[PDB]
Each structure stands twice: as C-alpha cells, then as structure tokens.
C-alpha cells in the first residue's frame, strides 16, 4: 500500500497519470481533431490536407 | 460440466505463411 | 503535539490585530492545510480562511493569512466591533487532526 | 448545505450516548467527502471525535478509538455516532460538519448539549 497522508510533502503526495498512446499510421483514421472540411476540387493546383 | 472422453505427421508447407506487412498500396515495385 | 496560541487579542476598531497559532511538534509535515474558524457563543463554528490564505464564500475581504516555518497567523484589518468571537486554528497530524487553544478577541473604545 | 443534530440531551453514567446526524444539499457518496463529529466541553477547545468516509473508511480520535462507533446510512442521508461508557465529566455540546481535506471542517450544524448525570 502507498498510505498517502495531508501531512506528506511534494514526492510522496498521489498523483493521477493519464498516458494516451497515439497511431500515426498508414491505416484510416478515426479520431481527428476538430477543424472543418472545404469542398473537393480537381484538375487544379491546390494546397491539399 | 466437462465430459471426460498416435503420432504427428509432417508436410510441405511450400510457399505460404507469407501476408501484407503493412497498410500501404504499392504497385510494380520490389519490396 | 499541540497548536499553540496566544489567550487573547485587542485594540480599537479600525486597528489592524494579528491572531498566531504554531506547531510544537514535526508530526504536521508541511503544515500547510491551516484553517482558522470564527466562534460566536450559541452559534454554529464559521469557516474564515483555509488552506493557509484561502477565504471560502460569504467572508469578508478583511480576513486574511500567512505563514512562516511552521507558524501561520490569522491578520483582521478594519477590526469591527462585530468582530468579537473565540478564533481557533485548526490543522493535520500523522494520525489524527488537532484544534488550537482558542483566542479571545477584544474590541477596544 | 445544511446537517441537523438529534439525540439525547441528558444520560446516565456508565450508559450509551447516541446521537443521529441528518444532512441534505450533498451527497456523502462522492470522492474528498466525509463527515465527522466534534465536541466542546465548556471553557475548552474544539476535540476531535469521530469521522466516517465515503467508502465507510472509519477513523476515529487516538484518544476515543475505544469508546466511539462511527456508521451511516446513504438511504437516509444520516450518520450515527455512539459513544460508550459516558463519564460525568464527558459534558460537551457535540456537533456534525462537513469533512473535506483542503478545509478540515465547515457547514457545522448548531450542536446539540449533552450533559451526564
Ligand atoms: C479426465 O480425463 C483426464 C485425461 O485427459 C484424466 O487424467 C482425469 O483423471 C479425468 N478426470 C476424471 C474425474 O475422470
């Protein structure tokens, strides 16, 4: 058991750890971060994402 | 409830066992 | 093991008065989860500061603190004649929480 | 945020003290709450009683830890403390509050005097 105390100091107090693991991969993605999508466009010169 | 109730043999396993290593499209190329 | 403070506190309204409160022992680690209560006879304990500094909701801007080492105090700026009550510290132990002796305030005129 | 004292104001030595806690506003069941019991002989200081967590982690003062039953019932929303064997000089205004870390005690209730004789 850790017995964590109000009276410990910095080092023995708890801490929560979240760790999120991440695939950059070659593979369709699923979780994608909140930005807006544009109309497709083709047979032009574009800046593409 | 469970119910209570010779030798291996070996073959030519050729050419199989081989699968895509990874998520990629490739085409005419040696990889 | 025991908080130790002062019998009593006075001066005249308007008048800044310091109430202090100190450990005696190790057995606070960092001491640094202090509360300080106000007590009027007949009523109910009324939380005034916590965590060292900290005012909780529905206390007045002219209650404060501090501390220094293992001491902490208590500042009442603007004393109030409505200010008259039994101040207590409070703060954690190894195996138990400990209430200091209790100061009595006095309000001059 | 409010918790209400009942019980008996006068018992007989050597007899059990018991004393019911009732609260609303909150609830004891969440993570950083509890609730304890504290008393107040006269001319002294606040005394550390009793205090019981919200997954029924039972903590009692090293002095009492003998005498004092913490319990509650989250269907009602009460805590019961006991206290055994009652001394003449164990006369003290008893009272409920809120026990949370960053705060020791707060929301306490009026208190309730209990005399022994
Ligand atoms: C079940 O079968 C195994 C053989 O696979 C045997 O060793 C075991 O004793 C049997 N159990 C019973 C209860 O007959």
Same mark, same amino acid.
């Given at each position: 058991? *850790?017995?964590?105390? @109000?009276?410990?100091?910095?080092?023995?107090? @708890? *801490?929560?750890?979240?760790?999120?693991?991440?695939?950059?991969?070659?593979?369709?993605?699923?979780?994608?971060? @909140?930005?807006?999508?544009? #109309?497709?466009?083709?047979?032009?010169?574009? #800046?593409?994402? | 409830?469970?119910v209570n109730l010779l030798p291996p043999a070996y073959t030519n396993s050729f050419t199989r066992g081989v699968y895509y290593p990874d998520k990629v499209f490739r085409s005419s190329?040696?990889? | 093991?025991?908080?130790?403070?002062?019998?009593?506190?006075? !001066?005249?309204? !308007?008048?800044?008065?310091?109430?202090?409160?100190?450990?005696?022992?190790?057995?606070?680690?960092? $001491?640094? $989860?202090?509360?300080?209560?106000?007590?009027?006879? !007949?009523?109910?304990?009324?939380?005034?500061i916590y965590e060292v500094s900290n005012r909780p909701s529905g206390v007045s801007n002219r209650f404060s603190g501090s501390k220094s080492g293992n001491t902490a105090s208590l500042?009442?700026?603007?004393?109030?004649?409505?200010?008259?009550?039994? $101040? $207590?510290?409070?703060?954690?132990?190894?195996?138990?929480?400990?209430?200091?002796?209790?100061?009595?305030?006095?309000?001059? !005129? | 945020? %409010?918790?209400?004292?009942?019980?008996?104001?006068?018992?007989?030595?050597?007899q059990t003290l018991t004393l019911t806690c009732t609260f609303s506003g909150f609830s004891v069941t969440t993570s950083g709450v509890g609730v304890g019991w504290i008393r107040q002989?006269?001319?002294?200081?606040?005394?550390?009683?009793?205090?019981?967590?919200?997954? =029924?982690?039972?903590?009692?003062?090293?002095?009492?830890?003998?005498?004092?039953?913490?319990?509650?019932?989250?269907?009602? &929303?009460? /805590?019961?403390?006991?206290?055994? &064997?009652? =001394?003449?000089?164990? %006369?003290?205004?008893?009272?409920?509050?809120?026990?949370?870390?960053?705060?020791?005690?707060?929301?306490?209730?009026?208190?309730?005097?209990?005399? /022994?004789?």
């Open positions: 058991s *850790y017995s964590f105390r @109000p009276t410990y100091g910095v080092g023995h107090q @708890p *801490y929560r750890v979240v760790v999120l693991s991440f695939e950059l991969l070659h593979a369709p993605a699923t979780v994608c971060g @909140p930005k807006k999508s544009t #109309n497709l466009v083709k047979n032009k010169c574009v #800046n593409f994402n | 409830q469970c190329v040696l990889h | 093991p025991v908080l130790t403070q002062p019998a009593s506190v006075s !001066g005249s309204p !308007g008048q800044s008065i310091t109430i202090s409160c100190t450990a005696t022992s190790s057995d606070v680690g960092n $001491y640094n $989860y202090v509360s300080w209560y106000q007590h009027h006879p !007949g009523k109910a304990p009324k939380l005034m500042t009442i700026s603007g004393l109030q004649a409505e200010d008259e009550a039994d $101040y $207590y510290c409070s703060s954690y132990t190894s195996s138990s929480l400990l209430f200091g002796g209790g100061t009595k305030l006095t309000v001059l !005129g | 945020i %409010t918790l209400k004292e009942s019980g008996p104001t006068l018992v007989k030595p050597t002989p006269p001319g002294k200081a606040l005394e550390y009683l009793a205090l019981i967590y919200w997954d =029924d982690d039972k903590r009692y003062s090293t002095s009492l830890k003998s005498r004092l039953t913490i319990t509650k019932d989250t269907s009602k &929303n009460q /805590v019961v403390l006991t206290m055994t &064997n009652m =001394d003449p000089v164990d %006369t003290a205004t008893y009272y409920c509050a809120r026990h949370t870390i960053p705060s020791i005690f707060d929301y306490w209730g009026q208190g309730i005097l209990v005399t /022994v004789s």
